[PDB]
């Protein structure tokens, strides 16, 4: 569990993966592909590129569509609990 105070445009990282758009063949997980410099994620350390996301305010992300994961990450107040 990595805690983050979301910033102006977001958590400060990008994602790929999800059912229908398998980042890795046969895998629907959501993976962190980029960490924006100076974003909240970066500054706070705990998360890095390549990490598999598990949950957001324990909405499990194990196997959901890419868009569901996006929304799940947009609709979580300034306070956020990660994986």
């Amino acid at each position: 569990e990595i805690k983050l105070i979301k910033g102006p445009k977001g958590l400060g990282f990008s994602i790929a993966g999800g059912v229908g758009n398998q980042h890795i063949p046969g895998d629907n997980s959501i993976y962190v592909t980029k960490i924006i410099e100076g974003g909240a994620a970066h500054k706070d350390g705990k998360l890095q590129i390549g990490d598999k996301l598990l949950a957001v305010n324990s909405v499990c992300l194990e196997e959901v569509t890419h868009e569901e994961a996006v929304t799940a990450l947009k609709n979580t107040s300034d306070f956020v609990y990660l994986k």
Binding site: G10, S14, I15, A16, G18, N21, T33, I36, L73
Partner: peptide, 6 residues
């Protein structure tokens, strides 16, 4: 192919 800024 979808990669998104969050």
């Amino acid at each position: 192919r979808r990669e998104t800024q969050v």
